[PDB]
Design a protein around this nucleic acid. Structure first.
Lengths: 129, 84, 150, 158, 190
RNA sequence: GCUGCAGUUAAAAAGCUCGUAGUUGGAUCUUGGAGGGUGCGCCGUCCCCGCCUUGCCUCCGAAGCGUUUACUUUGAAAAAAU
């Protein structure tokens, strides 16, 4: 069955972009999917998206450009300690310079750059570049 | 799958061909009707697929028998849908 | 998909959006609640009441013409019976299989099947019990089950 | 209630004396037993039962001679087999880096239970407080019964 | 006057007074009285539409609404005609309760009902702003600029009563939530 | 071989299923200009913060005081040698 819903949305995306696709319909969506789709959006990795309202759990249409090499999800959502964030981005990001680790902290779902600036930390959601 | 559809606005024709659960936003593919039988003049509302015998208001009549799917309406009968 | 077989089959209602309606639906909460209570008097199950209501008389969902699910209506009138209906028909089914197996000790398929049914029961009861519906300490026993379902 | 006094020795609170005396009504006097109590501190309300009660329990934190100092813990009641004492199960998380997931682990803790508390029933979450060695096993004393009919799985009433 | 029907904890006035009087004007009549009489209103608020025709929003107790729904179209027709130059409609005051924190404190205040959530309430507002149509579906669009727009699908039949309104519904909605709303038409399953 | 292994044929998926512990579990309940750190020669560049419904109540402090946690964050408490 389903343990997580994010992992499906992310994968669906990745296969869309790999095909050469410019849109996807993910299902079923969640506040966390929105928040993650949103961080991606702010940065450029996707275009605009749209939450369609079935009387159920939702369905999202993402319009994607093609700046996206990969958006992954980290499971389980490990706790990170401010100097485990430095260790994570190195593990899974292309160059020190770019790509984001996106985690969930007490003060919001955020990319790790925003994390560093706020100076808060938490549990790791996923990534992209 | 040639990198071309508007997943958000898909066509009504190919939306209408797809499984009820596969529809963009879901919805059913079943309906209701009003049914006649001259002898009476009033009209019983009936569900397109039905399982139950449906009998009319008074006359022990009939008014379809069930099947795998849509109820088979019985011989000399008439039916407007229908609403919204 | 499926619990005690390899079946995949997606199959369902597909419930309607439209928030309100039917609109061509007149009648009233009054009407169908009476209808429900009278049918439940006759011994009918909520599944059964929902079906017969659906097809014979206009009720797309009893929920919509009345903000309450059929079972809740029954329970509030005072029509709810001792164990939930799904659990009933399971217990009843394991009974009929058990009676058939006592007759035909040579049927291994039946013995397998009895197990399956029984496991489904025990888990369901575990769920109902967790949820107060059944008194903690509720159990289904062959011995007593026969006597229970009727 | 049940006659306390039950044993062979006369149960009494130390240095809380009597003296009944002559004349009329009561008779002697009506309460017939002066009772001494105290609040544990840490804002633990001394339940009415303690003040209202006849029971003796030296071990009681409110009525008895024991002080609560040290760790204040909470746990779930696993057993109430023993008279005036209970066993609580304490769940805790063990962290294992060497690769990192820690695994639930637990410990049971024997703790004295004053007759002031009742309905101490297994399943109840309870707040116990550290104390002087009461018995070879028991380090703690039940200070507060957290409760709840909740956990619904049944319907509690009042 | 002001006392009766503009109440709901404050008397007040002006517009509330005018509209109330209008209701009385309607009240003289037949079946176009007695049916209304029971209905009552908490307050009226006025907010405009961008070129400058204003919309008038009316507030209802919520147990009342079924009856208001009963009339609605006929009444709105009267209020638009008598009070012309305004878009009239009907919204029910709904309570909304804050999600508890934590340290919000929390003296575990009685649960609360989904039928009290801010989102649910807003959904109710959307439902209330349009009327006999029905909201067929909804979508949310995430704009490049961190913005969000809600596309609220509408039925088809009988819509006309609302067609001219649409812009006000958008503006009115904004005043209440601060979110942006857009409207569309469908399709007809085949 | 956590990070970071292999198991159709190379060494390796139990004949199959039920199933307790254990692990694992869908969607959904708050929104919609300046203060301070270090670079570059009075100017600015780049974080961080309250902003353009956000602890209630008791009735500024105090107190009541926490729904439980885990988490994470900021402090203290943290032997020297190393």
């Amino acid at each position: 069955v389903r343990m997580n819903v994010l992992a499906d949305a992310l994968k669906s995306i990745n296969n869309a972009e790999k095909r050469g696709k410019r849109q996807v319909l993910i299902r079923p969506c969640s506040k966390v999917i929105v928040r993650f789709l949103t961080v991606m959006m702010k940065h450029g990795y996707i275009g605009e998206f749209e939450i369609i309202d079935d009387h159920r759990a939702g369905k999202i249409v993402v319009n994607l450009t093609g700046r996206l090499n990969k958006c992954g999800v980290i499971s389980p959502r490990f706790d990170v300690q401010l100097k485990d964030l430095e260790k994570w981005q190195n593990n899974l990001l292309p160059s020190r310079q770019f790509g984001f680790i996106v985690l969930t902290t007490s003060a919001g779902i955020m990319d790790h750059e925003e994390a560093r600036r706020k100076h808060t930390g938490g549990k790791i959601l996923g990534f992209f570049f | 799958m040639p990198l071309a559809k508007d997943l958000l606005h898909p066509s009504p024709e190919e939306e209408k061909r797809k499984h009820k659960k596969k529809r963009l936003v879901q919805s059913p593919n079943s309906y209701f009707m009003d049914v006649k039988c001259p002898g009476c003049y009033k009209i019983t509302t009936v569900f397109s697929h039905a399982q139950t015998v449906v009998l009319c208001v008074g006359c022990s009549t009939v008014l379809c028998q069930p099947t795998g799917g849509k109820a088979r309406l019985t011989e000399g009968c008439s039916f407007r849908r229908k609403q919204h | 998909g499926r619990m005690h077989a390899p079946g995949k089959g997606l199959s369902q209602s597909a419930l309607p959006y439209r928030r309100s309606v039917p609109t061509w639906l007149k009648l009233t909460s009054d009407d169908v609640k009476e209808q429900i209570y009278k049918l439940a008097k006759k011994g009918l199950t909520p599944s059964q009441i929902g079906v017969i209501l659906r097809d014979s008389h206009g009720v797309a969902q009893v929920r919509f013409v009345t903000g309450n699910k059929i079972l809740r209506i029954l329970k509030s009138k005072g029509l709810a019976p001792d164990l939930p209906e799904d659990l009933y028909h399971l217990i009843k089914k394991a009974v009929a299989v058990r009676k058939h197996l006592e007759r035909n000790r040579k049927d291994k398929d039946a013995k397998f099947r009895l197990i399956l049914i029984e496991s489904r029961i025990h888990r369901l009861a575990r769920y109902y019990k967790t949820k107060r519906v059944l008194p903690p300490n509720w159990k289904y026993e062959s011995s007593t089950a026969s006597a229970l379902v009727a | 209630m049940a006659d306390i006094q039950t044993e062979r020795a006369y149960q009494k609170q130390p240095t809380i004396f009597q003296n009944k005396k002559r004349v009329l009504l009561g008779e002697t006097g009506k309460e017939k037993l002066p009772r001494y109590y105290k609040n544990i501190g840490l804002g633990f309300k001394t339940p009415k039962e303690a003040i209202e009660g006849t029971y003796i329990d030296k071990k009681c934190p409110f009525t008895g001679n024991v002080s609560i100092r040290g760790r204040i813990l909470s746990g779930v009641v696993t057993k109430m087999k023993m008279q005036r004492t209970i066993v609580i199960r304490r769940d805790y998380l063990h962290y294992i880096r060497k690769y990192n997931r820690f695994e639930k682990r637990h410990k049971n803790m024997s703790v004295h239970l004053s007759p002031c508390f009742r309905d101490v029933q297994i399943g109840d979450i309870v707040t116990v407080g550290e104390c002087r060695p009461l018995s070879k096993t028991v380090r703690f004393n039940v200070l507060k019964v957290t409760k709840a009919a909740g956990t619904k799985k049944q319907f509690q009433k009042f | 006057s002001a006392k009766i029907v503009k109440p709901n904890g404050e008397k007040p006035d002006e517009f509330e007074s005018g509209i109330s009087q209008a209701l009385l004007e309607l009240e003289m009549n037949s079946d176009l009285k007695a049916q209304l009489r029971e209905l009552n209103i908490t307050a009226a608020k006025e907010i405009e539409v961008g070129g400058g025709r204003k919309a008038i929003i009316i507030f209802v107790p919520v147990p009342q609404l079924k009856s208001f729904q009963k009339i609605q179209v006929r009444l709105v027709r009267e209020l638009e005609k008598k009070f012309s130059g305004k878009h009239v409609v009907f919204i029910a005051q709904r309570r909304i309760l804050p999600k508890p924190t934590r340290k919000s404190r929390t003296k575990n205040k009685q649960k609360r009902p989904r039928s009290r959530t801010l989102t649910a309430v807003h959904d109710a507002i959307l439902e209330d702003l349009v009327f006999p149509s029905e909201i067929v579906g909804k979508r949310i669009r995430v704009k490049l600029d961190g913005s969000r727009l809600i596309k609220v699908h509408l039925d088809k039949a009988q819509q006309n009563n609302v067609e001219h309104k649409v812009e006000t519904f958008s503006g009115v909605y904004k005043k209440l939530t601060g979110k942006d709303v857009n409207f569309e038409f469908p399709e007809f399953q085949l």
